[PDB]
């Protein structure tokens, strides 16, 4: 069986590096490609299609081209920017619902190795930021009706599989 996932979420939230490091099992470090693909991984037997998108703004007009008979989204926001989380709401859950009005939601948290990390959350505090935390998270979740919270570090791998087995399961 062959299931379309499509992830979305703000530029530079860790789409692209979600996907890579999840079907290579590696970080793609300094050069991420910069051809918006899809992906495929076969998971246990599913083929999990994974359809990454442009996020700027530049492209709001297509970006919608590549969700019909999407089985389900990944909606993601950088865990260290509360700008790409305010965004779920304010422009990526309208955006899915409007094209998309039953298609199942996953939200995902990326880049969770950089909540503790020192020099982005004292760069965060002097914008009065702070990271989002998991119950922030999961509060989102609920409101916007995802069927999953999940956090992730592509970096290090740290809850990636579970990202994708969660989108399997969403489906089926
Ligand atoms: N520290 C850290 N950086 C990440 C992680 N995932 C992505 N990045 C970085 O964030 C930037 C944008 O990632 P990319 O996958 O291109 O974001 P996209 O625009 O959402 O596809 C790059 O500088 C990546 O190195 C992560 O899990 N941890
Ligand atoms: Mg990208």
Same mark, same amino acid.
């Given at each position: 069986?062959?299931?379309?996932?499509?992830?979305?979420?703000?530029?530079?939230?860790?789409?692209?590096?979600?996907?890579?490091?999840?079907?290579?099992?590696?970080?793609?470090?300094?050069?991420?490609?910069?051809?918006?693909?899809?992906?495929?991984?076969?998971?246990? @037997?599913?083929? %999990?299609?994974?359809?990454?998108?442009?996020?700027?703004? /530049?492209? $709001?007009?297509?970006?919608? &081209?590549?969700?019909?008979?999407?089985?389900?989204?990944?909606?993601?926001?950088?865990?260290?920017?509360?700008?790409?989380?305010?965004?779920?709401?304010?422009?990526?859950?309208?955006?899915?619902?409007?094209?998309?009005?039953?298609? @199942?939601?996953? %939200?995902?948290?990326?880049?969770?190795?950089?909540?503790? /990390?020192? $020099?982005?959350?004292?760069? &965060?505090?002097?914008?009065?930021?702070?990271?989002?935390?998991?119950?922030?998270?999961?509060?989102?979740?609920?409101?916007?009706?995802?069927?999953?919270?999940?956090?992730?570090?592509?970096?290090?791998?740290?809850?990636?599989?579970?990202?994708?087995?969660?989108?399997?399961?969403?489906?089926?």
């Amino acid at each position: 069986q062959a299931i379309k996932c499509v992830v979305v979420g703000d530029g530079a939230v860790g789409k692209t590096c979600l996907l890579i490091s999840y079907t290579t099992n590696a970080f793609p470090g300094e050069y991420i490609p910069t051809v918006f693909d899809n992906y495929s991984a076969n998971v246990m @037997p599913v083929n %999990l299609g994974l359809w990454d998108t442009a996020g700027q703004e /530049d492209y $709001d007009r297509l970006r919608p &081209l590549s969700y019909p008979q999407t089985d389900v989204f990944l909606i993601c926001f950088s865990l260290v920017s509360p700008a790409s989380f305010e965004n779920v709401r304010a422009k990526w859950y309208p955006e899915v619902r409007h094209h998309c009005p039953n298609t @199942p939601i996953i %939200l995902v948290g990326t880049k969770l190795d950089l909540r503790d /990390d020192k $020099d982005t959350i004292e760069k &965060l505090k002097e914008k009065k930021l702070t990271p989002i935390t998991y119950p922030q998270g999961l509060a989102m979740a609920k409101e916007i009706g995802a069927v999953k919270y999940l956090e992730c570090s592509a970096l290090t791998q740290r809850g990636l599989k579970t990202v994708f087995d969660e989108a399997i399961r969403a489906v089926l």
